[PDB]
Structure 1
């Protein structure tokens, strides 16, 4: 039996006044027959995508800025203003649907203190449930500076996430600059879900792990989409290499390295979602490694179709239950894991 009240939390929007920027994303990610729907959905949080969510048994949608969003704005002052405008916009949109909509903060990640202050404003003044940031922050007068969040200056930001007790969703973004030119110009259809997205996110979150972010902040919560961005299939190989090479080599140099086994972080600090990965077999493999309580349903609208993602979870209920360990596990992944993680009250169809 399928369920209603599902929680979906990798659902993107853009500011309506930047509709022209969304045509550029459409040329990277949207087939011609899907263009009309994409443009309507990405610019209207309360439009047809809400009607489809109601029809297909979603109880609570958490909205976030699309990609790269602020992470593609290389001038700090403009970036900070854009992020604020995104947060004020989506706060106004979700205001009329409090029983079935929430939001993640959009952030400028040029400066850790400023990002901490905007996250605090979103959570404590606007009721947002976390942050969603599109991989590395690009910067400089030519856009080549790549700002990663696994370096020590970001500790003030991680402390803010822990103080607010909200998660950080690390979302992918397309290649930029020389990386785009050198490695993707001759294979442009690999920009996005086929490989480039997960290549970047996996690099970044493994960076957080090996640079000790979760050792310094054991209560930090991070979310990865797409069933973990290539990492679960490599759980054995990565941990093996850390044991065989990386940990003793770093120790011999006095270099910082992760204190715990790889799977510790994926069983304590990291949650996965099913965004764009409507795969019962891949879901099963992930459940077997991280536990059914650590995986959250999500669609990845508007790049994926709500009816398709919900159709997978709903229409294959019996097979998915068998794969993930029974009825409670199935309802946990669909709804109750996220209900507990985000401390959601009663919401639309939640019981």
Structure 2
């Protein structure tokens, strides 16, 4: 299947590169490094060889979310976004960009997102879970009240926000002490991101800004399997859930969320997500360079779904969501 669109597709600057060291063995770092740093050459060749037309590119993790001085976070984000704009400009038929944002500061993040969308032509933002800010004794999650004006900006711009993983801070990771093998994509990434997404849904954010679009990778980080139980546990009790949101968690999931196939090339899992959130809200993605493009594409080529849904998940959903077949993207 030619013409696919992929949107969990990462790169690094020299400035952010070392954030990804640790996620593979030392013997494999030279390869990973080379993939992270390459946008124009081998990446596009692999795209051609595996039927990907468009990668929506994003900076690696945690990157800006781990820069605790918010003035410095803003500087790094601006440099990364300017670099990404230049790279997109070199092969504008094959690439679009997601914004890196200094979520340490709601005002700075909102201003940078405006600049990325209006001046740089980016199509959304990607953020690696919670932020570290020296001013806060605690990690910053985006349900907290100070973010609500930032979200108002996201909805006004009408671009999606990709809530990507990061690892929990060590003081929030004691269950994994001695079992470091569970950190990262094995498990801890998914728990961290699932809970952050649920915090957004419970907070009532989507009652106030109901047109927001949030994207989750990895088939939704376990959410579809357990979504029934989130709302329906202890169903004999007739009560009002003790969160500020007005409706069921599943309502916000169904209405405000999209899931990608990144790093979760498993047909059973895809089928469960289809039967829970529907194929209209599922997007192809690879997680290159942490996963192989050929692994992602070969799995998706043959996974057990209808040809109609293979086209929607492969490219139709993303083309519509990111308005890529519209005049502003094609001609301006």
- TM-score, normalised to structure 1, is 0.88
1:139 matched to which residue of 2? 133
Unaligned runs of 5+ in 2: none
Asked if 1:184 corresponds to 2:171, the answer is no
TM superposition shift of 1:92: 0.8
Is the helix fraction higher in 1 or 2?
A: 1
Equivalent of residue 6 in structure 2, options 2, 5, 8? 8
Q: RMSD value over aligned CA atoms? A: 2.1
TM superposition shift of 1:144: 5.1
Q: Is the 8 Å Cα contact of residues 247 and 257 (structure 1) preserved in structure 2?
A: no
TM superposition shift of 1:184: 3.0
Asked if 1:342 corresponds to 2:313, the answer is no
Equivalent of residue 164 in structure 2, options 141, 161, 171? 171
Provide the C-alpha distance between the structure 2 equivalents of 1:337 and 1:117, rounded to a whole number of angstroms: 28
**1:255-311 CA distances to partner (integer Å, 9 max, x unpaired)?**
x52222232222211000000001111001100111111000000011101111111
User: Cα–Cα, structure 1 residues 79 and 327, in superposed 2: closer, same or farther, change >3 Å?
Assistant: same
Provide the C-alpha distance between the structure 1 equivalents of 2:308 and 2:216, rounded to a whole number of angstroms: 22
1:297-336 equivalences in 2 (<5 Å): 297-314=284-301, 316=302, 320=303, 323-324=304-305, 326-336=306-316
1:146-157 equivalences in 2 (<5 Å): 146-157=139-150
Which structure's relative contact order is higher, taking Cα pairs within 8 Å and 6+ residues apart? 1
Asked if 1:203 corresponds to 2:198, the answer is no
- Match of 1:332, SS state, is helix
Equivalent of residue 108 in structure 2, options 107, 114, 120? 114
2:259 matched to which residue of 1? 272
User: Cα–Cα, structure 1 residues 17 and 303, in superposed 2: closer, same or farther, change >3 Å?
Assistant: same
User: Cα–Cα, structure 1 residues 183 and 283, in superposed 2: closer, same or farther, change >3 Å?
Assistant: same
1:234-313 equivalences in 2 (<5 Å): 234-241=226-233, 248=240, 250=242, 256-313=243-300
Provide the C-alpha distance between the structure 2 equivalents of 1:82 and 1:344, rounded to a whole number of angstroms: 28
TM superposition shift of 1:174: 1.6
1:48-127 equivalences in 2 (<5 Å): 48-127=42-121
Question: What is the number of residues matched between the two proteins?
Answer: 328
Provide the C-alpha distance between the structure 1 equivalents of 2:170 and 2:237, rounded to a whole number of angstroms: 32
2:21 matched to which residue of 1? 26
- Match of 2:286, SS state, is coil
User: Cα–Cα, structure 1 residues 162 and 346, in superposed 2: closer, same or farther, change >3 Å?
Assistant: closer
User: Cα–Cα, structure 1 residues 247 and 87, in superposed 2: closer, same or farther, change >3 Å?
Assistant: farther
- Match of 2:119, SS state, is helix
User: Cα–Cα, structure 1 residues 88 and 238, in superposed 2: closer, same or farther, change >3 Å?
Assistant: same
Q: Is the 8 Å Cα contact of residues 40 and 47 (structure 1) preserved in structure 2?
A: no
**1:36-69 CA distances to partner (integer Å, 9 max, x unpaired)?**
3211111121131221111101011011111101
Q: Is the 8 Å Cα contact of residues 131 and 167 (structure 1) preserved in structure 2?
A: yes
Provide the C-alpha distance between the structure 2 equivalents of 1:144 and 1:4, rounded to a whole number of angstroms: 49
**1:69-121 CA distances to partner (integer Å, 9 max, x unpaired)?**
10011111111111111101111111111111001000011111111000000
User: Cα–Cα, structure 1 residues 131 and 57, in superposed 2: closer, same or farther, change >3 Å?
Assistant: same
- TM-score, normalised to structure 2, is 0.93
- Match of 1:61, SS state, is strand
